[model samples]
Target: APSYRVKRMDIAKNDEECVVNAANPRGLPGNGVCKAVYKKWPESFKNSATPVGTAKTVMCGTYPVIHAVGPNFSNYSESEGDRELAAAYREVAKEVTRLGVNSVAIPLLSTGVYSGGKDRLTQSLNHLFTAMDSTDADVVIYCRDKEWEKKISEAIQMRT
Candidate 1:
């Protein structure tokens, strides 16, 4: 069974065998989580773009960084956005299992700078949990802000 936790920490600094990056389809560093991760692990990216709904992997330091490109809400309807988000999480789970990763850190994808609102964060997290059903890896949903952590904690309890 998969286990998940809500942590008040930066995903980039989390000690996990794998780290999930919410990336752009273009793979360039945007603001928020993407930029923070990119700064911490510059070697993981080199203009190589993962398609929306897919993830690419690279070993930077202690873990293999999984770059999962979630869809932009600006260009998609609600259903389509959720599908792509689910697909991205699916890819992340695949990589986690394939690489035999024991733990992974994930941020709330597309919620920052991707036009996904507060409602979208909860729905996106549902897709993430569903994707993780195939792996037993310990999952950490991390954020630096207290309110974001509260939102995540509340949602996780709701899931239970």
Candidate 2:
């Protein structure tokens, strides 16, 4: 079975075959993960529009970044937020399988300025766990240091 793990590390410096960029629809440099991402790569963004609940795989030499556009809660009801967020995770998983990567790093989608709380983060993880079932890569969730520590630790518990 494909495995799941979580780490408190900078998403940009991880050794995973691919990194998940929690992106806006414009796919340009945005806040949170993308800020650090663009600060490092600067040229990583596709500068194209990726709809909410969709993902785009970007090639940066041998290291690929999968840009996932998740729903912003400020724009939707709880059900719509949940629906689109789940689709985003599913799409990320689809891209992972499509890429055939051995390992991939993902972050909690819409759990930040989108105003998603622990419940939403838990919901995000549950969606990802289900979405990952079709793939064989070892999945890792990179959390910001000290933040989401409880959420990260419970990934395995949440899985099985």
Candidate 3:
């Protein structure tokens, strides 16, 4: 079964069905997965998008890079922050799972440019992993670098 520790595996074949993109509306992969894939031009990608509640189309990069606005606008409190994170997860879950995406790579949302700092990044990732019910689909969290992997691993361990 898939656990909360997401993953980062190399695509064994080129131009597979699709790769999930765990990004926000900004088209930026905070932890480097998207950038890495784009750098390598792994293959032709197809992004899947979903609507976050009633807002705009969520910018989750599940397929070729889904693009949509999210409701997490400027709410920086802990509770609000988590709420936004959960929303993002929900958006990702709905889009990727519904489209039947099997293998997908994701980055730590808000962990880079979108994050206020490490503390916020931890909270965001924790909220998503703890709250989202991943009964289907193999989700992988792509860390941008060694430092990011270390921090993310530590935070996930601490929470679990």
lDDT scores in order:
0.84, 0.81, 0.47
What does the lDDT read for residue 139 in candidate 3?
49
TM-score of each: 0.92, 0.91, 0.58
The number of the candidate with the highest TM-score is: 1
After TM-score superposition, the amount by which residue 59's alpha carbon in candidate 2 deviates from its true location, in angstroms, is 0.4
- List, residue by residue over 55-95, the lDDT tens digit for candidate 3: 12223244434332233435466566656667666665665
Better model by TM-score: candidate 1 vs candidate 2: 1
Better of 1 and 3 by TM-score: 1
Instruction: Give the distance in Å from residue 34's predicted Cα in candidate 2 to where it truly belongs.
Output: 1.3
lDDT-best of 2 and 3: 2
Candidate 1 TM-score, C-alpha based? 0.92
RMSD (CA, Å), each prediction: 1.7, 1.8, 5.8
Residues 49-157 of candidate 1 have per-residue lDDT tens digits of 8899999997876578899988888788988987888899999999999999888999877776675454566777888889987899999988877887888788777
Better of 2 and 3 by TM-score: 2
Candidate 1 backbone collisions, by pair: none
Where does candidate 2 stray beyond 4 Å? 116-119, 145-147
